[PDB]
């Protein structure tokens, strides 16, 4: 009665249309001219497609909001989706719920989702989009601002298009310590961060079963690393195979190193950086060399006594400074075919050499046939 | 207020806060009002999107704008936007599979074509020479792409991979040439040969190599310059005739180019070519640490 | 009056008119999806799972609802629901 009129007003004001533009569904009602239809049973309203001829009458309206009329059919739920006219259901994935329409959203802790599959859709309590069909076409689809923020924050760049075509994740290939939250001030101990960055590229166990095992590690995808800040570390770094290290420029007699690696260990009787060479054990297994003075001989490589795990390693402008007293700067052992350009070791701290930030022995190399050191400083 | 209808149905906007729904989101009109939108319209066909025209509004529109943009909506430090610093190309942009199983040929070709699209047939010397005066672009290959037809590198191309293979047992990053007709080359630079009618056709003959004389008398015209290769790894099916045809590449440079795979003991089934590299008419060409 | 307001609030949230309840001391909250504060003239989605028999104790100007089974900051719930 008057209740119908006041309801038409509420609906009209919600969609921003005129009161006369709202129609109640009923078998046989004329749909012509109306902008919004109201289902008195479900108590849901839907924008109507423009172009319904006058004289066209309603035949049926399903609980999934599929409207059949004298001149054809239309999925009002799909139309609502296209128009971002949504209903946020009470509850959430945690509480569980049942969805019946395409324009219904269910709230998850990281944003809202609509269901793109078969309706009705039952979601048991304690669910997540993942456990109830996953996300993507025909399943859960992310909807709204909160959901967009979390997707962007936790993604890989696939939501960002780039030229000439494709998405951001297609062109992001270089790694940095900043991805691991390294401080990079040459004061904080960034060791664990640098080690994780390397492990994420090629994680080789310090102990391996046999020769086939150690060799497999030289057959992995190679990744380029960009060092743009100064990273203090306190334990010998072991570069695994398939690693390219880059820095904008190489140091040349610099008083204050600002970009690169700064080795500052408790035990100075060690090396800052070493390549990987595995030594044969009594039981027949192999352990990564961690001895500062060890270097493999050609004989070792043939005896099986040593197996190299240093290959596909390229260095461009790596600057390495060390605390005074450190024994060795770089241990280039077993690096056959490995290359270097602008590797710069040591800092020109000041006149007194005993306090300068450079090592006693700059570089020690063996078993490195075919390696090239271009413009080593 | 989201007006009834859409761009498909057409509409008329009278207020600045009115939105018209399109297939990829909503838009408001930032130009003169009232604004009439004919049925069957699109934002691009009725003013374009930008200040004074259609302005994207709402989360749905934001998603599609970001998804189909160039990164101009993303600010970066110290200033400018993302598109200002994205300069490298990758097969992934073209949806290459990169597993060394699927045939990624058309994807790679499209990538090269998007950099410098050189027709296989040209009218004269001037025409072929023009393709050497185009913007150069750097390509990053980080996966393994199987391909089945000779790739012709056009001028103005830089190719890099993080590291160079070295007696590599299982190639993981680079190009794997696996054709039906093995009497071919995996990679070749472009050299145009004069035709009886005076026009020029791209060389696609595996045994052909231009001579200095050829270049002098115009029988051959090089379309190979401004090409730089850093760490390209090229493996091929057993029995492939030639890995790389470095023909007419004067001043072209290479560093860490690594050809062939140390597959196993039986060289007969090793993924390496019969002839690694064939070079002619490449004065001033430098190959640093070629493997 | 109250019925027309219930209609207005219901259409805003996409619930049934009978699913809207007005806050008052002692009002039973069981089964309702939306609560309305007649003083501030603001409405809020109710947390799900409030049993029949659970009555309202108080509702602050900051939308903190205290009832028989405990309490809920309807403001926080609305944020999680992007109902602003």
XYZ file of C-alpha atoms in Angstrom:
752
model
C 0.000 0.000 0.000
C 1.735 3.124 1.267
C 4.481 0.721 2.325
C 5.133 -0.045 -1.353
C 5.471 3.646 -2.137
C 7.884 4.335 0.723
C 9.919 1.267 -0.256
C 10.148 2.450 -3.855
C 11.560 5.688 -2.427
C 14.190 3.894 -0.345
C 15.223 1.856 -3.380
C 15.154 4.849 -5.721
C 17.369 6.897 -3.402
C 19.820 4.037 -3.096
C 20.337 3.709 -6.868
C 19.887 7.406 -7.578
C 16.892 6.950 -9.861
C 13.320 8.299 -9.727
C 10.622 6.773 -7.515
C 8.505 6.131 -10.605
C 11.422 4.190 -12.115
C 11.204 1.381 -9.563
C 8.996 -1.654 -10.320
C 8.079 -4.631 -8.131
C 8.393 -8.041 -9.733
C 5.150 -9.953 -10.242
C 4.171 -12.446 -12.930
C 2.709 -10.339 -15.731
C 3.811 -6.845 -14.696
C 4.841 -4.510 -17.537
C 8.593 -3.866 -17.401
C 8.830 -1.086 -19.990
C 10.505 2.165 -18.926
C 11.584 1.012 -15.459
C 15.204 1.408 -14.331
C 15.195 -0.795 -11.229
C 13.261 -3.929 -10.266
C 12.529 -5.066 -6.722
C 12.064 -8.691 -5.639
C 9.660 -8.474 -2.684
C 10.480 -12.033 -1.554
C 14.287 -11.836 -1.381
C 13.995 -8.090 -0.702
C 16.766 -7.320 -3.213
C 16.791 -4.652 -5.919
C 18.475 -4.789 -9.339
C 19.143 -2.252 -12.078
C 17.331 -3.285 -15.266
C 18.890 -3.382 -18.707
C 17.959 -0.309 -20.751
C 15.862 -1.140 -23.817
C 12.967 -3.214 -22.442
C 10.122 -2.496 -24.834
C 6.830 -1.210 -23.449
C 4.287 -4.015 -23.206
C 7.014 -6.501 -22.281
C 5.832 -8.399 -19.205
C 7.591 -10.339 -16.422
C 7.547 -14.148 -16.566
C 9.826 -15.206 -13.697
C 12.645 -14.067 -11.419
C 14.886 -16.742 -9.875
C 16.715 -16.459 -6.561
C 19.896 -16.049 -8.607
C 18.182 -12.988 -10.047
C 17.723 -14.384 -13.549
C 14.781 -12.481 -15.031
C 12.663 -14.015 -17.788
C 10.151 -11.756 -19.551
C 7.933 -11.902 -22.660
C 10.726 -10.676 -24.980
C 13.598 -12.772 -23.654
C 15.890 -13.190 -20.648
C 18.621 -11.380 -18.667
C 20.917 -12.195 -15.744
C 20.401 -9.252 -13.382
C 23.211 -10.532 -11.147
C 25.747 -10.320 -13.963
C 24.460 -6.890 -14.884
C 24.797 -5.814 -11.255
C 28.409 -7.058 -11.225
C 29.243 -4.982 -14.322
C 27.736 -1.948 -12.588
C 29.542 -2.544 -9.260
C 26.164 -2.665 -7.490
C 26.911 -5.188 -4.772
C 25.496 -6.591 -1.576
C 27.961 -7.393 1.174
C 26.568 -10.411 2.983
C 26.663 -10.602 6.747
C 29.518 -12.638 8.167
C 32.618 -13.818 6.381
C 34.618 -16.782 5.158
C 35.342 -17.501 8.816
C 31.687 -17.564 9.851
C 30.564 -19.295 6.669
C 27.633 -18.260 4.475
C 25.598 -19.199 1.405
C 25.708 -17.130 -1.766
C 22.832 -17.103 -4.270
C 23.579 -14.130 -6.516
C 26.579 -13.024 -8.598
C 26.453 -9.567 -6.996
C 26.911 -10.908 -3.475
C 30.248 -10.351 -1.740
C 31.732 -12.336 1.158
C 34.295 -10.603 3.386
C 37.691 -12.190 4.023
C 40.433 -10.756 6.243
C 42.175 -9.302 3.167
C 39.180 -7.852 1.292
C 35.937 -8.950 -0.397
C 35.220 -11.591 -3.032
C 32.373 -12.473 -5.380
C 31.754 -16.049 -6.594
C 32.083 -16.681 -10.326
C 31.112 -20.362 -10.306
C 27.961 -22.436 -9.896
C 25.296 -20.910 -7.659
C 24.150 -21.332 -4.973
C 27.534 -21.564 -3.247
C 27.915 -22.842 0.304
C 30.890 -21.745 2.370
C 31.477 -23.696 5.563
C 32.736 -21.934 8.693
C 36.530 -21.582 8.943
C 36.860 -21.333 5.152
C 39.200 -19.201 3.011
C 38.898 -18.437 -0.703
C 41.738 -20.913 -1.217
C 40.002 -23.809 0.536
C 36.716 -23.202 -1.265
C 37.651 -23.214 -4.945
C 40.564 -20.789 -5.173
C 40.710 -17.447 -6.960
C 40.287 -16.886 -10.691
C 37.712 -17.326 -13.446
C 34.890 -19.645 -12.470
C 35.842 -19.320 -8.798
C 36.456 -16.447 -6.339
C 37.115 -13.009 -7.824
C 38.671 -10.184 -5.786
C 36.439 -7.110 -5.519
C 36.891 -3.597 -4.153
C 39.513 -1.236 -2.844
C 40.622 -3.116 0.281
C 41.044 -6.256 -1.792
C 43.006 -4.346 -4.456
C 45.400 -2.918 -1.840
C 46.225 -6.337 -0.364
C 46.558 -7.936 -3.806
C 49.010 -5.220 -4.870
C 50.910 -5.494 -1.603
C 51.213 -9.285 -1.704
C 51.571 -9.852 -5.439
C 54.475 -9.996 -7.882
C 53.477 -7.126 -10.144
C 51.133 -9.074 -12.410
C 48.373 -6.489 -11.815
C 50.555 -3.797 -13.447
C 50.576 -3.626 -17.253
C 53.696 -2.432 -19.112
C 54.706 -1.521 -22.660
C 54.740 -2.713 -25.351
C 52.680 -5.430 -23.683
C 52.724 -7.767 -20.709
C 52.942 -7.071 -17.006
C 55.527 -5.777 -14.512
C 56.429 -9.244 -13.169
C 57.574 -10.144 -16.703
C 60.506 -7.696 -16.529
C 61.612 -7.761 -12.870
C 64.643 -10.067 -12.809
C 67.385 -8.482 -10.667
C 67.648 -9.096 -6.905
C 68.822 -6.668 -4.237
C 69.560 -7.026 -0.533
C 66.857 -4.368 0.009
C 64.297 -7.059 -0.851
C 65.488 -8.794 2.313
C 65.501 -5.593 4.365
C 69.267 -5.250 4.614
C 70.177 -2.009 6.404
C 73.040 -1.251 4.046
C 74.817 1.286 6.262
C 77.969 -0.795 6.720
C 77.253 -0.781 10.462
C 74.378 -3.185 11.047
C 75.189 -6.845 10.501
C 73.549 -7.716 7.186
C 75.064 -11.223 7.018
C 71.840 -13.208 7.463
C 70.137 -11.083 4.789
C 72.912 -11.555 2.220
C 72.972 -15.278 2.948
C 69.220 -15.545 2.439
C 69.434 -13.573 -0.806
C 72.039 -16.077 -2.059
C 70.166 -19.098 -0.727
C 67.023 -17.945 -2.556
C 69.037 -18.167 -5.791
C 71.002 -21.393 -5.279
C 70.720 -23.131 -1.896
C 73.448 -25.756 -1.832
C 73.812 -27.944 1.322
C 77.203 -27.853 3.035
C 77.230 -31.648 2.982
C 76.329 -33.743 -0.055
C 76.151 -37.538 -0.759
C 78.326 -37.900 -3.871
C 79.854 -36.273 -6.944
C 76.563 -36.366 -8.844
C 74.998 -34.404 -5.988
C 77.545 -31.571 -5.866
C 77.558 -31.291 -9.669
C 73.785 -30.891 -9.919
C 74.079 -27.480 -8.240
C 75.909 -26.055 -11.263
C 72.821 -26.748 -13.345
C 70.400 -24.213 -11.871
C 68.900 -20.934 -13.055
C 71.330 -18.008 -12.746
C 70.290 -14.717 -11.154
C 71.810 -11.224 -11.293
C 72.355 -9.311 -8.035
C 72.580 -5.529 -7.709
C 74.474 -4.056 -4.744
C 73.863 -0.314 -4.484
C 74.531 0.245 -0.766
C 77.182 -0.818 1.784
C 76.719 -4.165 3.516
C 78.641 -5.166 6.602
C 78.899 -8.928 7.110
C 80.728 -11.047 9.684
C 81.113 -14.572 8.327
C 82.652 -15.828 5.081
C 80.191 -15.592 2.202
C 80.148 -18.563 -0.171
C 78.948 -17.651 -3.656
C 76.963 -20.522 -5.128
C 77.045 -21.264 -8.872
C 74.785 -19.279 -11.220
C 75.262 -15.827 -9.703
C 76.011 -12.480 -11.322
C 76.956 -9.581 -9.045
C 76.697 -5.984 -10.211
C 77.514 -2.515 -8.804
C 77.304 0.804 -10.748
C 81.045 1.623 -10.572
C 84.269 0.130 -9.307
C 86.276 1.653 -6.464
C 89.696 3.062 -7.322
C 91.871 3.969 -4.334
C 88.765 5.190 -2.497
C 89.116 6.552 1.042
C 85.562 5.752 2.013
C 83.797 2.812 0.421
C 80.093 3.565 -0.008
C 78.886 0.609 -2.090
C 79.718 -3.079 -1.749
C 80.654 -5.649 0.895
C 82.441 -4.928 4.221
C 83.822 -8.028 5.936
C 84.179 -7.500 9.691
C 84.613 -10.863 11.491
C 85.633 -11.723 15.058
C 88.020 -14.304 13.625
C 90.387 -12.461 11.294
C 92.175 -15.686 10.313
C 89.631 -16.113 7.504
C 88.474 -15.042 4.043
C 85.752 -12.515 3.199
C 84.377 -14.268 0.105
C 84.966 -17.739 -1.259
C 83.800 -19.843 -4.162
C 82.528 -23.367 -3.403
C 84.809 -26.375 -3.483
C 83.740 -29.673 -1.942
C 86.328 -31.931 -0.317
C 85.997 -35.712 -0.121
C 85.359 -37.223 3.303
C 86.491 -40.601 4.735
C 82.951 -42.040 4.489
C 82.812 -41.082 0.808
C 80.634 -37.991 1.127
C 81.575 -34.379 0.383
C 81.779 -31.271 2.600
C 82.046 -27.628 1.536
C 85.538 -26.278 2.141
C 85.505 -23.792 4.997
C 89.264 -23.754 5.610
C 90.899 -20.384 4.861
C 94.200 -21.889 3.683
C 92.740 -24.686 1.544
C 92.886 -24.490 -2.256
C 92.245 -27.394 -4.634
C 94.931 -28.756 -6.958
C 94.508 -30.158 -10.469
C 95.303 -33.538 -8.936
C 92.440 -33.168 -6.410
C 89.999 -32.465 -9.237
C 91.098 -35.736 -10.906
C 91.443 -37.786 -7.692
C 87.844 -37.053 -6.815
C 89.376 -35.674 -3.598
C 87.860 -32.340 -4.532
C 84.854 -31.448 -6.623
C 84.297 -27.876 -7.650
C 80.944 -26.190 -7.292
C 82.060 -22.874 -8.780
C 80.674 -22.221 -12.247
C 78.541 -19.641 -14.073
C 79.631 -16.875 -11.714
C 80.171 -13.377 -13.137
C 81.301 -10.274 -11.221
C 80.938 -6.634 -12.299
C 82.408 -3.846 -10.132
C 82.139 -5.704 -6.827
C 83.889 -3.632 -4.154
C 85.135 -5.575 -1.147
C 86.642 -3.915 1.900
C 87.797 -5.744 4.976
C 88.656 -4.932 8.598
C 92.423 -4.545 9.170
C 94.084 -7.906 9.830
C 91.685 -10.059 7.811
C 93.758 -12.783 6.120
C 92.243 -13.172 2.640
C 89.952 -10.961 0.575
C 88.716 -13.317 -2.153
C 89.240 -17.099 -2.492
C 88.771 -17.715 -6.235
C 89.028 -21.498 -5.966
C 87.663 -23.919 -8.564
C 86.186 -21.080 -10.616
C 86.909 -22.491 -14.067
C 85.398 -20.265 -16.763
C 84.204 -17.773 -14.146
C 84.741 -14.123 -14.951
C 85.371 -10.797 -13.290
C 85.360 -7.112 -14.361
C 86.204 -4.233 -12.039
C 86.478 -6.389 -8.923
C 87.984 -3.939 -6.440
C 89.512 -5.124 -3.154
C 90.518 -2.887 -0.255
C 89.992 0.664 0.937
C 92.488 3.548 0.869
C 91.451 4.440 4.443
C 94.450 6.607 5.283
C 98.229 6.911 5.495
C 98.702 4.224 8.174
C 98.396 0.844 6.464
C 98.042 -1.093 9.731
C 94.632 0.511 10.254
C 93.506 0.520 6.597
C 90.417 -1.471 5.650
C 92.119 -3.933 3.283
C 93.228 -7.566 3.645
C 96.704 -9.027 4.106
C 96.246 -11.175 0.986
C 93.933 -9.748 -1.685
C 93.097 -12.753 -3.831
C 94.096 -16.422 -3.808
C 93.290 -18.522 -6.894
C 93.607 -22.172 -7.969
C 91.842 -24.702 -10.214
C 90.463 -21.809 -12.254
C 91.367 -22.587 -15.845
C 89.692 -20.310 -18.369
C 88.838 -17.621 -15.816
C 89.291 -13.987 -16.835
C 89.903 -11.081 -14.455
C 89.356 -7.837 -16.359
C 90.686 -4.677 -14.732
C 91.123 -6.142 -11.239
C 92.040 -3.584 -8.549
C 25.324 8.269 -9.187
C 25.694 5.412 -11.688
C 23.304 6.169 -14.555
C 21.044 3.445 -15.931
C 22.404 1.923 -19.104
C 25.928 2.028 -20.460
C 28.155 3.062 -23.313
C 26.522 0.246 -25.317
C 23.047 1.697 -24.798
C 24.217 5.294 -24.936
C 23.118 7.990 -22.485
C 23.206 11.658 -21.563
C 25.236 13.039 -18.694
C 24.132 16.274 -17.017
C 26.073 16.386 -13.752
C 29.726 16.030 -12.805
C 29.005 13.241 -10.330
C 27.281 11.014 -12.901
C 29.078 7.824 -13.957
C 28.509 5.843 -17.132
C 29.343 2.143 -17.072
C 31.600 0.692 -19.789
C 32.854 -2.897 -20.041
C 36.017 -2.179 -18.041
C 34.674 0.129 -15.375
C 32.957 3.455 -14.814
C 33.843 6.924 -16.060
C 32.680 10.485 -15.317
C 32.687 13.282 -17.902
C 35.213 16.056 -17.204
C 34.338 18.183 -20.243
C 31.423 20.369 -21.269
C 27.994 19.303 -19.985
C 25.489 18.152 -20.990
C 27.319 15.310 -22.717
C 25.510 13.102 -25.191
C 26.782 9.558 -25.643
C 25.415 7.750 -28.708
C 24.516 4.057 -28.434
C 27.487 1.846 -29.253
C 30.049 4.351 -27.983
C 33.343 3.758 -26.147
C 35.340 6.192 -23.998
C 38.121 6.143 -26.621
C 35.680 6.960 -29.424
C 33.898 9.747 -27.554
C 36.712 11.980 -26.312
C 39.354 9.633 -24.952
C 40.308 9.361 -21.300
C 42.085 12.247 -19.590
C 41.572 15.737 -18.159
C 38.700 17.509 -19.869
C 37.294 14.201 -21.186
C 36.491 10.790 -19.697
C 37.914 10.281 -16.212
C 38.202 6.777 -14.784
C 36.343 6.333 -11.480
C 36.015 3.487 -9.001
C 37.851 0.313 -8.167
C 36.813 -1.649 -11.257
C 38.165 1.107 -13.506
C 41.342 1.350 -11.433
C 42.027 -2.375 -11.905
C 41.671 -2.211 -15.689
C 43.628 1.065 -15.951
C 46.533 -0.502 -14.058
C 46.247 -3.784 -15.974
C 46.362 -2.153 -19.427
C 48.640 0.784 -18.727
C 52.374 1.329 -19.092
C 53.107 2.083 -15.446
C 52.430 5.830 -15.687
C 50.116 5.596 -12.667
C 52.963 4.348 -10.450
C 55.256 6.995 -8.909
C 58.937 6.203 -8.363
C 61.968 7.763 -6.674
C 63.565 10.227 -6.781
C 60.895 11.398 -9.210
C 58.917 10.422 -12.301
C 56.808 7.327 -12.863
C 57.437 3.612 -13.455
C 57.210 3.823 -17.251
C 60.175 6.265 -17.183
C 62.571 3.481 -16.126
C 61.270 0.264 -17.750
C 63.424 -0.197 -20.846
C 64.279 -3.901 -21.144
C 62.242 -6.504 -23.096
C 61.593 -10.123 -22.244
C 59.962 -13.151 -23.931
C 57.676 -13.285 -20.885
C 56.025 -10.060 -22.045
C 54.896 -12.081 -25.023
C 53.860 -15.047 -22.868
C 56.705 -17.336 -23.913
C 56.540 -20.598 -21.926
C 60.285 -20.754 -21.367
C 60.472 -24.447 -20.469
C 62.426 -25.507 -23.545
C 59.567 -27.872 -24.428
C 56.861 -25.655 -25.898
C 57.564 -24.012 -29.258
C 58.226 -20.353 -28.349
C 59.232 -19.388 -31.903
C 56.392 -16.960 -32.758
C 56.764 -15.259 -29.381
C 60.501 -14.633 -29.877
C 59.924 -13.465 -33.448
C 57.223 -11.085 -32.233
C 59.620 -9.742 -29.605
C 62.271 -9.061 -32.255
C 59.663 -7.661 -34.627
C 58.444 -5.195 -31.953
C 62.009 -3.814 -31.797
C 62.873 -3.551 -35.482
C 60.518 -5.149 -38.038
C 62.619 -5.679 -41.166
C 60.830 -6.865 -44.338
C 62.381 -9.882 -46.029
C 62.136 -8.124 -49.387
C 63.255 -4.553 -50.099
C 63.341 -2.275 -53.215
C 66.860 -0.882 -52.980
C 70.027 -0.132 -51.057
C 68.529 2.949 -49.392
C 65.585 0.927 -48.096
C 67.686 -1.769 -46.428
C 70.086 0.842 -45.011
C 67.219 2.608 -43.228
C 66.654 -0.312 -40.833
C 70.134 0.253 -39.350
C 69.016 3.722 -38.220
C 66.360 2.698 -35.684
C 66.209 2.809 -31.871
C 68.086 -0.078 -30.198
C 66.513 -2.139 -27.419
C 67.916 -4.503 -24.802
C 66.509 -8.039 -24.392
C 66.821 -10.084 -21.185
C 66.579 -13.881 -21.552
C 66.151 -15.539 -18.141
C 64.421 -18.806 -19.043
C 64.893 -21.521 -21.708
C 63.179 -20.942 -25.032
C 62.791 -23.725 -27.581
C 62.346 -22.514 -31.148
C 62.075 -24.266 -34.509
C 62.981 -21.831 -37.297
C 66.060 -19.695 -37.844
C 65.887 -16.450 -35.849
C 67.142 -13.419 -37.750
C 68.443 -10.703 -35.409
C 67.668 -7.234 -36.767
C 69.972 -4.275 -36.153
C 69.692 -2.343 -32.894
C 69.479 -5.287 -30.518
C 71.185 -6.010 -27.234
C 70.791 -9.498 -25.732
C 71.845 -10.452 -22.206
C 71.564 -13.377 -19.783
C 72.824 -13.238 -16.177
C 75.682 -15.739 -16.797
C 77.352 -17.621 -19.661
C 77.211 -21.445 -19.941
C 80.495 -23.314 -19.515
C 80.559 -27.039 -20.278
C 76.968 -26.880 -19.052
C 75.288 -30.273 -18.771
C 71.724 -28.969 -18.780
C 71.132 -25.563 -20.340
C 68.572 -23.647 -18.263
C 68.722 -20.168 -19.759
C 69.012 -19.308 -23.427
C 67.816 -20.526 -26.800
C 67.372 -24.159 -27.864
C 67.144 -24.581 -31.650
C 65.097 -27.683 -32.503
C 63.966 -27.670 -36.173
C 62.615 -30.338 -38.519
C 65.067 -29.300 -41.227
C 68.452 -29.582 -39.514
C 70.369 -28.246 -42.550
C 69.858 -24.767 -41.175
C 71.338 -22.210 -38.799
C 69.949 -21.499 -35.336
C 70.703 -17.767 -35.307
C 71.696 -15.465 -38.152
C 72.391 -11.814 -38.762
C 70.639 -10.186 -41.758
C 72.319 -9.925 -45.153
C 70.358 -8.887 -48.243
C 71.173 -10.333 -51.657
C 70.538 -8.552 -54.943
C 67.915 -10.088 -57.225
C 67.845 -10.218 -61.025
C 65.247 -7.404 -60.988
C 67.387 -5.167 -58.757
C 65.373 -5.658 -55.574
C 66.818 -7.296 -52.448
C 65.839 -10.443 -50.509
C 66.971 -11.495 -47.039
C 69.442 -14.352 -47.087
C 67.934 -17.487 -45.693
C 70.415 -19.931 -47.212
C 72.459 -21.701 -44.527
C 75.660 -21.953 -46.612
C 75.586 -18.387 -47.917
C 78.076 -15.837 -46.612
C 78.789 -12.468 -48.201
C 82.280 -11.637 -49.483
C 83.978 -8.240 -49.263
C 83.543 -7.995 -53.018
C 79.808 -8.710 -52.688
C 79.471 -5.759 -50.270
C 81.569 -3.575 -52.599
C 79.611 -4.169 -55.816
C 76.184 -4.216 -54.143
C 75.507 -7.899 -54.837
C 75.083 -8.084 -51.074
C 73.964 -5.448 -48.584
C 74.472 -5.882 -44.849
C 71.632 -5.189 -42.437
C 73.698 -6.215 -39.460
C 74.978 -3.489 -37.139
C 74.366 -2.067 -33.642
C 74.068 -5.634 -32.331
C 75.544 -6.557 -28.948
C 75.432 -9.967 -27.211
C 76.277 -10.567 -23.560
C 76.171 -14.181 -22.304
C 73.739 -15.630 -24.853
C 73.584 -19.396 -24.418
C 72.692 -21.275 -27.576
C 72.139 -25.017 -27.622
C 70.695 -26.956 -30.515
C 69.296 -30.331 -31.519
C 71.953 -32.898 -32.456
C 72.776 -32.653 -36.154
C 71.981 -28.953 -36.622
C 74.404 -27.656 -39.258
C 75.320 -24.207 -37.912
C 74.793 -22.578 -34.530
C 75.451 -18.904 -35.340
C 75.833 -17.119 -38.690
C 77.699 -13.920 -37.852
C 77.556 -12.513 -41.381
C 77.978 -8.868 -42.323
C 78.189 -7.883 -38.651
C 80.809 -5.106 -38.911
C 81.389 -3.501 -35.516
C 79.014 -5.976 -33.828
C 80.191 -7.243 -30.481
C 79.856 -10.282 -28.331
C 80.839 -11.212 -24.742
C 80.356 -14.637 -23.194
C 78.476 -16.048 -26.214
C 78.266 -19.735 -25.250
C 77.291 -22.331 -27.893
C 76.448 -25.993 -27.275
C 75.564 -28.230 -24.343
C 77.761 -30.822 -22.620
C 74.795 -33.234 -22.781
C 76.670 -36.511 -22.293
C 79.544 -38.723 -23.501
C 77.924 -39.574 -26.805
C 78.635 -36.575 -29.029
C 76.147 -38.068 -31.505
C 73.247 -37.188 -29.177
C 74.787 -34.058 -27.621
C 72.729 -30.870 -27.983
C 75.377 -28.933 -29.932
C 75.766 -28.031 -33.613
C 78.022 -29.459 -36.333
C 79.524 -26.012 -36.975
C 79.483 -23.594 -34.043
C 79.904 -20.221 -35.740
C 80.422 -19.029 -39.339
C 81.612 -15.461 -39.887
C 82.224 -13.206 -42.871
C 82.197 -9.468 -43.714
C 82.449 -8.563 -40.033
C 85.389 -6.179 -39.965
C 85.840 -4.543 -36.566
C 83.812 -7.280 -34.890
C 84.912 -8.253 -31.401
C 84.088 -11.571 -29.688
C 85.140 -11.474 -26.020
C 85.436 -14.834 -24.243
C 83.460 -16.809 -26.841
C 82.676 -20.396 -25.712
C 7.834 5.977 10.885
C 10.057 3.278 12.351
C 8.941 0.901 9.603
C 9.852 3.292 6.805
C 13.256 3.877 8.415
C 13.770 0.112 8.666
C 13.055 -0.058 4.945
C 15.606 2.700 4.209
C 18.313 1.074 6.314
C 17.533 -2.392 4.914
C 17.872 -1.265 1.303
C 21.173 0.449 2.133
C 22.652 -2.796 3.469
C 20.818 -5.314 1.251
C 18.997 -7.091 4.082
C 15.330 -7.676 4.892
C 13.330 -5.056 6.741
C 12.727 -7.593 9.509
C 16.503 -8.024 9.862
C 16.976 -4.470 11.146
C 16.704 -3.818 14.902
C 16.727 -0.523 16.784
C 19.006 -0.244 19.765
C 17.351 0.096 23.177
C 18.394 -1.130 26.603
C 17.355 -4.757 26.948
C 16.490 -5.303 23.266
C 16.993 -8.896 22.109
C 19.675 -8.986 19.396
C 19.277 -12.589 18.218
C 18.983 -13.077 14.447
C 19.181 -9.453 13.320
C 21.756 -8.455 10.686
C 21.732 -4.662 11.232
C 21.328 -2.471 14.315
C 20.159 1.199 14.217
C 20.975 3.901 16.813
C 18.056 6.342 16.964
C 20.167 8.958 18.722
C 23.083 9.226 16.290
C 20.940 8.060 13.386
C 23.656 5.608 12.333
C 23.263 1.933 11.384
C 25.762 -0.910 11.619
C 26.042 -4.498 10.441
C 25.927 -6.798 13.488
C 28.546 -9.488 14.018
C 27.143 -12.868 13.058
C 26.344 -15.521 15.677
C 24.443 -13.514 18.270
C 22.047 -16.031 19.821
C 18.347 -15.477 20.489
C 18.221 -14.508 24.161
C 21.225 -12.173 24.010
C 20.061 -8.705 25.032
C 21.586 -5.255 24.526
C 23.131 -3.499 27.517
C 24.615 -0.346 25.949
C 25.668 1.389 22.729
C 28.202 4.245 22.853
C 28.642 7.252 20.583
C 31.752 5.445 19.270
C 29.497 2.485 18.304
C 30.747 0.092 20.965
C 27.910 -2.348 21.660
C 27.774 -4.099 25.005
C 25.364 -7.027 25.376
C 24.621 -10.212 27.346
C 27.275 -12.350 25.648
C 29.986 -9.697 25.490
C 30.845 -6.675 23.357
C 31.724 -5.535 19.865
C 33.088 -2.335 18.357
C 30.658 -1.983 15.437
C 32.961 0.701 14.086
C 35.787 -1.833 13.661
C 33.416 -4.383 12.188
C 32.169 -1.781 9.679
C 35.778 -0.968 8.638
C 36.491 -4.652 8.001
C 33.324 -4.612 5.904
C 34.168 -1.337 4.113
C 30.889 0.158 5.332
C 31.759 3.809 5.821
